[PDB]
Amino acid sequence: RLAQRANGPATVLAIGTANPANVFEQSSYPDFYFDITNSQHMTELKLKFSRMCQKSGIKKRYMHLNSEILKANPSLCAYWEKSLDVRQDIAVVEVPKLGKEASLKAIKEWGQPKSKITHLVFCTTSGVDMPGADWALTKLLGLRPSVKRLMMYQQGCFAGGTVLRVAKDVAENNKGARVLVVCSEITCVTFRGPSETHLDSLVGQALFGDGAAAVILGSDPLPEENPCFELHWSGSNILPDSDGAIDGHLREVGLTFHLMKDVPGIISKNIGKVLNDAFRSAFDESGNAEDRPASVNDIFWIAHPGGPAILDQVEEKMKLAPEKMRATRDVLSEYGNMSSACVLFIMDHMRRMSAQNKLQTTGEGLDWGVLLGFGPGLTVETVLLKSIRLA
Amino acid sequence: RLAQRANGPATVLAIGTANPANVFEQSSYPDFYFDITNSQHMTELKLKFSRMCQKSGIKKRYMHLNSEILKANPSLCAYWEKSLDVRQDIAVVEVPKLGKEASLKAIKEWGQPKSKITHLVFCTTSGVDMPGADWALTKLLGLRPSVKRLMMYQQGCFAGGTVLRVAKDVAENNKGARVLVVCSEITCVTFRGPSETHLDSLVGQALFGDGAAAVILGSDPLPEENPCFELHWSGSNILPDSDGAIDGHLREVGLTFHLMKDVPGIISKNIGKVLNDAFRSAFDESGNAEDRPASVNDIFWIAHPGGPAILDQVEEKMKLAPEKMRATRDVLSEYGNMSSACVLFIMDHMRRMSAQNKLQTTGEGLDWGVLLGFGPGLTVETVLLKSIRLAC
Numbered sequence: 001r002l003a004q005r006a007n008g009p010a011t012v013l014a015i016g017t018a019n020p021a022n023v024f025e026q027s028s029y030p031d032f033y034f035d036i037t038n039s040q041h042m043t044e045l046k047l048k049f050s051r052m053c054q055k056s057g058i059k060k061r062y063m064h065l066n067s068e069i070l071k072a073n074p075s076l077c078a079y080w081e082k083s084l085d086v087r088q089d090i091a092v093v094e095v096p097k098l099g100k101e102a103s104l105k106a107i108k109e110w111g112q113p114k115s116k117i118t119h120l121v122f123c124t125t126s127g128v129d130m131p132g133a134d135w136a137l138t139k140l141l142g143l144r145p146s147v148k149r150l151m152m153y154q155q156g157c158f159a160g161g162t163v164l165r166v167a168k169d170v171a172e173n174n175k176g177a178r179v180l181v182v183c184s185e186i187t188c189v190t191f192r193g194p195s196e197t198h199l200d201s202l203v204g205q206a207l208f209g210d211g212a213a214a215v216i217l218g219s220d221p222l223p224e225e226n227p228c229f230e231l232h233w234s235g236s237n238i239l240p241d242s243d244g245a246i247d248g249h250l251r252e253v254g255l256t257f258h259l260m261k262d263v264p265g266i267i268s269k270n271i272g273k274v275l276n277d278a279f280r281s282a283f284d285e286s287g288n289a290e291d292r293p294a295s296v297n298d299i300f301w302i303a304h305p306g307g308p309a310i311l312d313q314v315e316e317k318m319k320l321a322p323e324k325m326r327a328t329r330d331v332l333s334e335y336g337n338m339s340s341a342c343v344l345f346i347m348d349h350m351r352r353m354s355a356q357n358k359l360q361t362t363g364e365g366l367d368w369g370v371l372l373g374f375g376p377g378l379t380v381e382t383v384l385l386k387s388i389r390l391a
Numbered sequence: 392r393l394a395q396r397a398n399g400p401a402t403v404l405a406i407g408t409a410n411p412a413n414v415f416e417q418s419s420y421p422d423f424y425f426d427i428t429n430s431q432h433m434t435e436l437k438l439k440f441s442r443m444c445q446k447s448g449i450k451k452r453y454m455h456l457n458s459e460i461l462k463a464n465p466s467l468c469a470y471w472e473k474s475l476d477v478r479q480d481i482a483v484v485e486v487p488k489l490g491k492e493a494s495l496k497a498i499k500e501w502g503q504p505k506s507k508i509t510h511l512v513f514c515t516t517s518g519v520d521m522p523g524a525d526w527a528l529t530k531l532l533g534l535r536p537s538v539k540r541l542m543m544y545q546q547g548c549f550a551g552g553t554v555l556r557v558a559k560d561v562a563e564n565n566k567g568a569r570v571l572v573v574c575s576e577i578t579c580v581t582f583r584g585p586s587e588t589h590l591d592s593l594v595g596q597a598l599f600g601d602g603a604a605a606v607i608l609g610s611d612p613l614p615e616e617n618p619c620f621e622l623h624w625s626g627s628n629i630l631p632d633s634d635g636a637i638d639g640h641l642r643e644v645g646l647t648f649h650l651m652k653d654v655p656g657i658i659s660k661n662i663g664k665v666l667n668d669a670f671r672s673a674f675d676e677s678g679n680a681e682d683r684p685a686s687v688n689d690i691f692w693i694a695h696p697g698g699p700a701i702l703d704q705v706e707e708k709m710k711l712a713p714e715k716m717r718a719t720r721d722v723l724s725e726y727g728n729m730s731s732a733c734v735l736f737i738m739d740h741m742r743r744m745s746a747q748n749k750l751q752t753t754g755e756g757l758d759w760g761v762l763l764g765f766g767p768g769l770t771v772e773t774v775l776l777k778s779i780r781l782a783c
Contacts, residue, residue: 001400002623002673002775005563009392082473084643128519128545130639131767138629145629150557153544154519166541166557172396173560232393238529238536248521252475252643282393376522384393 004175006219009386010168012229013178014216015348016105018098019062019209019335020186026058026336033205036070037077037193045194045202052206057308057329061209061336064094065191079193082252090188091127095212096136099124099184102214103141110216111224112178117143117216119179121167123152123159123340125248125255126186137182156248157306159183160343161373161381164217165234168383171219184212185339189255200257207307209336213344228351228362229369233282233384239270242378263306266378268313275318275370278382293368297321300369300387302346305332310374327353327364343371355390363387395566397610400777401559403620404569405607406739407496409489410453410600410726411577417449417727424596427461428468428584436585443597448699448720452600452727454578455485461582470584470592473643481579482518487527489603490515490575494532497571497605502615508534508607510561510570514543514554514731516639516646517577528573547639548697550574551734552764552772555608556625559774562610575603576730580646591648598698600727604735619742619753624673624775630661633769654697657769659704666709666761669773684759688712691760691778693737696723701765718744718755734762746781754778 024032030050034040069090070076075083099122107114120143122134129136132151137143150170155162160183167179187208194202221227239245245261275296283292293299301324305311311325311332327350331342338345351362359365366387373381415423421441425431460481461467466474490513498505511534513525520527523542528534541561546553551574558570578599583592612618630636635651666687674683684690692715696702702716702723718741722733729736742753750756757778764772 002677002679003625004677005396082643084475088641125521128641130516130545130547130637131770132545135629135768135770139634145631146627148556148625148627150541150543150553151546152542154521154523155542156521162541165539169560169564172392173564234394234539236537236539238526240536246521249479250519251479252473286393286395288393377526379522379526 005173006171006175006177008219010171010217010219010231011221011227012215013218013221013225013227014106014110015344016102016109016214017211017345017348018101018105019211020064020098022063022066023060024063025060026053026056029053034194036067039194042194045196049194049202049206052203055308056206057332058207058336059333063210064090064186065188076191077193079195080198080253083254084252087189087254088127091186092129094186094188095124095126095184096133096140098186098210098212099133099137099182099214100140102184102212103137103180103182106214106216114141115144116178117147117180118174118177119148119170121150121152121163121179121181123155123163123183124185125154125156125339126189128153133184154250155340156246156375157304157339158373158375158379158381159340160304161371161383163340164231164371164383165381167217168231168234171217177218179217181215181217182212183340183344185341186210192254200259204257207337209338211335211338211341211345213341213348215344227388229347229388230386231383232386233278235278235281235382237274237380239266239378239380242266245378246376248376263378264309264313267310267374267380268317271314272318274380274382278384282384297324298366300350300363300366301325301328302343302350302369302371303328304342304372304374305329305337306374307337308332343373347371359390361387361389396564397562397566397568399610401562401608401610401622402612402618403606403738404609404612404616404618405497405501406735407493407500407605408602408736408739409492409496410602411455411489413454413457415452415454417444417447417451420444425585427458430585433585436587440585440593440597443594446699447597448696448723449598449727450724454601456579456582467582468584470586470589471644474645475643478580478645479518479520482577483520485577485579486515486517486575487524487531489577489601490524490528490573490605491531493575493603493605494528494571494573497607501607505532506535507569508538508571509565509568510539512541512543512554512558512570512572514546514550514574515576516545516547516730517580519544524575545641546731547637547766548695548730549764549766549770549772550731551695552762552774554731555622555762555774556772558608559622559625562608568609570608572606572608573603574731574735576732577601583645591650595648598728600729602726602729602732602736604732604739606735618779620738620779621777622774623777624669626669626672626773628665628771628773630657630769630771633657636769637767639767654769655700655704658701658765658771659708662705663709665771665773669775673775688715689757691741691754691757692716692719693734693741693760693762694719695734695763695765696720696728697765698728699723734764749783750781752778752780
């Protein structure tokens with residue numbers, strides 16, 4: 001061919017993460033949030049929010065927004081106010097900044113020159129600009145000017161799966177390709193003051209946090225590179241009877257989510273079939289039936305923690321051992337819902353805990369695993385993973 | 392790797408196009424535009440705009456916006472009024488609708504059941520929403536609910552190249568994959584009234600039009616399918632010294648472009664090296680030096696017609712024969728600048744004219760060609776195409 005292809009499976013060769021420096025402990029967030037938005041007098045609504053925070057599964061989050069910025073930009077503190085211009089101004093610089101920070105850590109781990117990066121996949125649901133955040137990152141890092149970019153704006157919470165699905169084909173179909181994959185998510189586009197008329201917004205204020213994660217992906221690893229996971233199969237599903245379950249509109253008041261169905265119920269009702277169909281396709285239909293794991297407790301799990309009820313209902317319906325959701329719940333606890341970045345943070349946490357506890361593989365000692373993104377559609381993104389053996 | 396890959400090059404198997412029903416003749420557009428925006432008193436600015444339209448290379452455009460919609464939505468007619476909410480309301484419906492019309496035509500040509508579409512790549516710079524226009528189109532067409540989607544928002548005018556670059560890997564790395572690739576672009580996010588204080592906006596009012604194009608792409612064509620082009624190589628380049636050349640910001644007043652450098656100058660100064668490096672990589676560095684075309688006049692050309700000066704200056708600097716740009720200029724003339732969709736309309740026009748005129752291949756009788764997208768960066772997207780031989 002005029003462009004050669006790679007031989008082996010796309011492999012994760014490094015993972016780096018970054019967060020803003022301002023930490024918000026969840027136990028004191030209702031006070032902070034109702035104070036800074038001049039809403040301290042809304043006693044009933046504040047109690048409702050306190051209960052939301054107490055039930056969130058979150059201990060702390062990191063956010064770029066803090067008191068000084070919010071005081072200087074009162075349209076962000078209002079409960080429903082035209083404010084997109086300010087939100088855009090913040091997002092168009094902070095999203096690639098946080099992405100740069102994560103990327104530098106990934107590249108340092110990887111240990112290869114940044115000039116060897118041939119492709120970039122950048123994902124965010126925080127703002128849009130032309131050129132996009134992919135271009136900004138390319139400039140900030142000094143990547144080769146011929147880097148081949150895939151800019152994925154406004155997809156929401158499932159896109160941690162999406163970027164891996166997309167990057168798999170890039171890595172596998174291009175000999176020598178090394179793909180930088182970045183998810184960077186920040187809450188400046190959704191932050192607003194509290195009101196009873198915008199309760200979906202209020203739920204987001206209990207859950208969403210800031211973070212970026214960067215992966216180096218490539219097929220046919222060099223001896224100097226260090227695999228930690230392989231991508232082996234990907235799929236997408238729009239779940240039945242889920243129209244309008246999660247909508248998000250970018251308006252002059254900022255990004256506004258509207259949820260209209262029982263998201264945990266829909267996900268947990270259908271996830272068994274999603275997984276059976278995925279593993280049947282990956283193993284049975286490819287002539288590798290013998291290698292198919294015997295149950296969902298015999299694989300490792302990386303699930304998007306959109307809220308704790310999703311995790312709880314999936315665990316119950318699928319009869320998961322109590323440890324299956326542990327790595328996922330740890331990231332929810334320590335960072336909150338960072339949208340697309342969560343599953344990459346969880347992947348990093350899992351490989352690090354597996355090494356720390358002297359397990360046999362990067363996937364909690366198990367060979368195969370599933371990574372799941374959940375978001376608007378209602379879309380489930382599924383990626384089947386293989387672990388890498390540890391000393 | 393638990394998932395089989397395809398063997399041959401990604402192949403275009405069908406192309407369908409659509410446009411809104413309202414036709415705007417360019418000769419009368421200054422009149423329409425200054426009338427509907429209540430700017431008739433701006434006689435000097437109208438004279439300027441008339442000259443812009445006379446120099447645009449455009450005979451007509453199609454737009455969803457019309458007098459009825461603009462009268463119903465006066466914030467669109469003002470020169471700088473907050474109006475993004477209205478623009479979004481229009482775009483989130485019209486973008487997938489136009490994409491559906493184009494896709495149905497592509498699928499009819501293709502002749503296979505729509506259930507065989509495994510992947511969807513959807514590209515627009517007109518609005519954003521969650522779920523996206525990809526999801527909306529999936530619902531409108533009744534595609535399989537397990538369709539694997541790649542939603543590309545807000546990239547601008549180079550993205551006709553981008554979607555082919557991206558879809559190439561999808562089709563080639565997945566045995567049996569059939570990819571619906573859709574570019575759907577409309578002017579409701581950029582339309583605004585005239586001002587001496589927003590001339591970049593005014594150039595866009597002379598050039599941008601509405602349209603969607605849909606391509607079916609797949610490797611290893613079946614006997615019942617009909618190849619018309621193959622994708623063989625792709626590249627991207629951020630051109631030197633081009634920061635700020637084309638910026639676009641989505642604001643409460645809608646989408647606003649700001650051009651801070653000489654776009655035709657930058658593209659024409661650098662395109663020789665882009666093309667030389669592309670053909671060197673594709674042929675020489677892959678062990679196929681002997682099949683590399685001898686000159687730029689020995690390949691067919693599909694260039695994004697961002698404006699007529701880009702085409703003129705590339706033609707001059709590259710010493711192209713006068714008809715190399717004809718297919719491109721024809722689409723600019725008949726439809727205007729439909730952003731990412733243009734190069735796909737040009738691909739369709741080229742295969743159709745080649746057949747009509749009984750030429751030996753779909754690429755004006757030539758074997759190899761280049762497709763070029765131009766946009767913010769300044770980014771050039773390059774795709775190297777092989778034509779398909781015709782029977783006559």
